[PDB]
């Protein structure tokens, strides 16, 4: 069966047995404006036979979008809590197996050893950047490495489920819903200088479907600050 | 009961090598402190996100002769000042400079043949804790480095020859133990798969995810 | 929704208040009153309008079929009054001739 | 003795007896934005030995100023009290009197009998729109008649204290404030398209000075809306 989920005027739908995993065993709390609580739905990307991955970086994710933007911009530093929740409807003729993980504090390789990457390679702003299969090409470029089996932060893709994550198997899952606490050394930080939580999703078992299917699943993500306050 | 934090990060760990001569080119050492020189203890933190612990800094300081033609040598006890400088203090630009002398900065005297010395340091930053990896730009505005937050800073460390011992050239070595204490770990994440190549940043090389074999089924 | 069991999607039902004029793009309809709707799931989604505005659909996204299973589908739209609802001053219908 | 009054961030200096007017015995209170309630400080308009007058409308007054203007845009409809004070600052050798008067509905009249003014002519945003002595021409100009005499309205000018109104005599008093309810026949009702209350200041008695004195003595108005809802 299904239900509706109401956060000021924005409604979602998702199952009776939604199968939250909460942060690390901590609701988002304040420290000790309501208008920003709301389900800010991005863009759905088509996940095909050949996509290798997807990442947002959840502040700048809502970066542009509405009251959160002008919130987090003449405010200076603040703190908030998060609820992603990653939608994929496909069919049952479909299989395939998706790693939902939220990485806090991911620092990303740069192609080139010698130098750092630049800001506008590393944050994809109201579009998700994605990771490639082959190696990047060091050369005089401060491009992000985006190797799969790597995934960026130089460490072996498998073990990457010591983070807060959730497995969608299109076998049995459907969805994942993943809670985030605010986790930063400092009580409150600038939101456009640092970006606390890395949102990552990985195909591990590729789709695969029977000629005369979809040719795409269209993952679907919303993000929902909770408990958000500033300075 | 032996895999706490505690007993796996409070390990004497050499992280510095270098020498200072009584006479000569170099007379002086310095080293800003930081725990990502030695690999085997970068490493071992980089399990941890957060990380906030005490320091015990011991140092060794050995004197070997050289080989010089001045004859009638009569060496005297050599006697080494170790000076730490806390972050934003003045750093000594020469050996015989003034900053040697500022009240701040806690220099310790020793004189050769004794009980090697040591002292420790509190936690200095600023946060609330040690931060392994950052995910942003220090400068506020932006056009600043990568992952390079300034709250990590924990100081330089200074050493000299008070007095030069004999007319003969003399060259000693210092090698400085970190030993973290009443350690604390938060965020686990995953260990690094590939090798570190500068200590400055994660910039690595991609690597395959393990050693390969002949079959699945072997 | 008026499809194939198969077929599954979402859709995203917007409704602008009065002063504003009808969004553009689904980003402008997203950020005002906004419902998204999944086919898979729920079959039929009701809509109470207080207080004229406009109401808006989009496709979040595409439908998604097994095959053997059309993809074109349809949508039929119900319309009621609801809770208080008064009517004054009784005038001649203008549909006579 | 002087005192401050604060509300939100902005702080006004006013005398220990400040001797309020309130509207009509009733007090700004909600239909039966907390942000909104601030003191919205307007420009200074130099007083002079021959200036006739000005008017302000409130509602437009407020057009363009920060919260209150981005309020009453996207927003549909809405009520708003007023607390305008008018502080005239002068030495004790000037000698001159005022007629502060807040006026609702005060329709104004046009130049040309033919037809009504334009919007521009009538409305003085971010400014004080003023009267003039002699008469307006009638000719084919959306003109508003601007006589001082006359106020606009059509009506003496004598008898406008039917109005809430308060005087200022610089050979006494110092300053007016004046208290004003949400006066409308519709309960709620679109700012922008409306104006309710229209502030008039009018100098019956000229200033006059002897020479090696300050050639001008600057009225200063501030707005504090009181009890703002919108739908």
């Known amino acids: 069966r299904a239900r509706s989920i109401t956060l000021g005027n924005s409604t979602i739908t998702t199952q009776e047995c939604a199968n939250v995993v909460v942060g690390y065993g901590v609701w988002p709390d304040y420290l000790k404006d309501v208008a920003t609580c709301r389900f800010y739905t991005l863009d759905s990307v088509q996940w095909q036979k050949t996509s290798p991955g997807w990442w947002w970086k959840l502040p700048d994710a809502l970066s542009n979008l509405g009251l959160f933007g002008q919130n987090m911009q003449y405010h200076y530093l603040g703190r908030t809590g998060y609820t992603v929740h990653v939608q994929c409807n496909a069919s049952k003729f479909h299989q395939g197996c998706l790693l939902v993980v939220c990485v806090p504090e991911a620092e990303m390789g740069c192609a080139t050893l010698d130098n750092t990457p630049s800001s506008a390679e590393l944050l994809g702003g109201d579009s998700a950047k994605e990771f490639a299969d082959k190696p990047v090409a060091s050369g005089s470029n401060k491009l992000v490495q985006r190797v799969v089996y790597n995934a960026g932060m130089g460490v072996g893709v498998g073990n990457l489920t010591i983070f807060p994550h959730q497995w969608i198997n299109l076998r049995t899952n459907n969805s994942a819903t993943i809670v985030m606490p605010y986790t930063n050394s400092v009580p409150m930080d600038n939101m456009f200088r640092h970006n606390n939580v890395t949102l990552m999703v990985i195909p591990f078992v590729p789709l695969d479907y029977c000629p005369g299917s979809t040719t795409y699943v269209p993952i679907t993500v919303t993000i929902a600050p909770m408990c958000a306050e500033y300075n | ?218 | 929704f008026c499809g194939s069991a198969m077929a599954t999607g979402k859709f995203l039902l917007a409704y602008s208040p009065p002063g504003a004029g009808a969004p553009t793009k689904r980003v402008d309809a997203m950020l005002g009153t906004h419902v998204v709707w999944d086919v898979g799931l729920q079959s039929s989604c009701v809509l109470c309008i207080p207080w004229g505005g406009f109401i808006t659909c989009w496709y979040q996204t595409n439908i998604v079929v097994p095959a053997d299973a059309q993809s074109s589908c349809y949508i039929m739209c119900f319309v009621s009054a609801c809770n208080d609802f008064s009517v004054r001053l009784l005038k001649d219908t203008p549909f006579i001739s």
Not at chain 2, 38 to 50: D, H, I, P, S, V
Not at chain 2, 57 to 77: G, H, K, R
Not at chain 2, 82 to 87: G, H, K, L, T
Not at chain 2, 152 to 166: D, E, I, P, Q
């Open chain 2, 1 to 218: 009961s032996e895999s706490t934090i505690e007993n796996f990060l409070c390990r004497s760990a050499c992280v510095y090598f270098t020498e200072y001569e009584n006479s000569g080119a170099k007379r002086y050492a310095e080293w800003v402190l930081t725990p990502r020189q030695a690999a085997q203890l970068r490493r071992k933190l980089e399990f941890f996100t957060y990380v906030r612990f005490d320091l015990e800094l011991t140092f060794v300081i050995t004197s070997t002769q050289q080989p010089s033609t001045t004859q009638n040598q009569d060496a005297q006890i050599l006697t080494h000042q170790i000076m730490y400088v806390p972050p934003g203090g003045p750093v000594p630009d020469k050996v015989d400079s003034y900053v040697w002398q500022t009240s701040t900065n806690p220099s310790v005297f020793w004189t050769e043949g004794n009980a090697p010395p040591r002292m420790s340091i509190p936690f200095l930053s600023i946060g609330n804790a040690y931060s392994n990896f950052y995910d942003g730009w220090s400068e506020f505005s932006r056009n600043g480095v990568y992952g390079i937050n300034t709250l990590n800073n924990m100081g330089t460390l200074y050493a000299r020859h008070v007095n030069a011992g004999s007319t003969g050239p003399i060259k000693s070595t210092i090698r400085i133990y970190f030993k973290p204490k009443h350690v604390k770990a938060w965020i686990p994440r995953p260990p690094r798969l590939c090798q570190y190549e500068k200590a400055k940043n994660v910039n690595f090389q991609p690597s395959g995810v393990t050693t390969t074999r002949q079959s699945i089924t072997t």
